[PDB]
């Protein structure tokens, strides 16, 4: 799809390991994602956890993306003028952790994962700005 | 998919670490490229150096692609029946360098970068071949 161009855009600055555009409404599945990443295997039930009414459970139980265990660092997904969440992978041992930001537009979610050592502020701004762009275009 | 399919054809035999399709006429910018690599960052000014009238300065001076310093190994971009160039990244402290081949069709340039150890000859054939296909197709 043409949605791969959005992945390209999110990857262009070299600070992200992967990116994705994911529907969360009727077309509740991955629309475009970096190949070989965890984002490409995000599932509808994982999407429901990100966007659902319960904004508490994931603090207690974590969540997964592409079956990868993660922690929720900040939830502003339904905060007007923000519409982001900050996430971090869990270290199975063993391996570095990676920061994840999610931006919520009207129809789609924007996911970015930083490379090793890339902090979450810059990622949040990226997710925010793209989700805002998409909201204003009707998405 | 659009021009992404051409990137994918360039990448599918495994010898490359990135590829790109780049216009040099009306739309003088990158059209499709491996996400998060060097080629996606090629600038119009760098395009102008690749396709410009001066075919000698870049031997003495090198050139950049995506701000990465490179050497010109062979220039045949305006040799009819060939229309390629051979380029190599420069090492700053002994880290590996990579070969780059460029093919020029009528409207677009084909860029390919080898994996470590991949020689320029096969890359040149790849770039030649795709640029010839595009040329024969009116591009």
């Amino acid at each position: 799809a043409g949605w791969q161009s959005y992945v390209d855009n999110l990857m262009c600055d070299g600070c992200c390991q992967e990116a994705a555009i994911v529907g969360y409404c009727d077309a509740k599945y991955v629309w475009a994602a970096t190949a070989g990443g965890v984002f490409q295997s995000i599932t509808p039930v994982e999407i429901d956890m990100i966007v659902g009414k319960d904004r508490e459970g994931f603090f207690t139980n974590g969540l997964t993306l592409g079956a990868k265990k993660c922690s929720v660092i900040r939830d502003s997904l339904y905060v007007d003028g923000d519409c982001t969440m900050d996430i971090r992978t869990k270290s199975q041992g063993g391996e570095p952790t990676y920061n994840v930001a999610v931006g919520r537009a009207g129809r789609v979610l924007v996911f970015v994962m930083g490379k090793e050592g890339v902090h979450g502020g810059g990622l949040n701004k990226k997710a925010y700005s793209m989700a805002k762009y998409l909201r204003d275009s009707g998405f | 998919a659009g021009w992404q399919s051409y990137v994918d054809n360039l990448m599918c035999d495994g010898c490359c670490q990135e590829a790109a399709i780049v216009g040099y006429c009306d739309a003088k910018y990158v059209w499709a490229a491996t996400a998060g690599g060097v080629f996606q960052s090629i600038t119009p000014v760098e395009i102008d150096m690749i396709v410009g009238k001066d075919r000698e300065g870049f031997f003495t001076n090198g050139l950049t692609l995506g701000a990465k310093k490179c050497s010109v190994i062979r220039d045949s971009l305006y040799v009819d029946g060939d229309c390629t160039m051979d380029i190599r990244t420069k090492s700053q402290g002994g880290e590996p360098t990579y070969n780059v081949a460029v093919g020029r069709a009528g409207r677009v340039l084909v860029f390919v970068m080898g994996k470590e150890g991949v020689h320029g000859g096969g890359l040149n054939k790849k770039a030649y071949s795709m640029a010839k296909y595009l040329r024969d197709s009116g591009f």
Partner: peptide
């Protein structure tokens, strides 16, 4: 899924 908003000429066909 719907086509995206704009963020290049159409390519020629590939073989096959």
């Amino acid at each position: 899924i719907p086509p995206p908003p704009p963020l290049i000429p159409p390519p020629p066909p590939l073989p096959g």
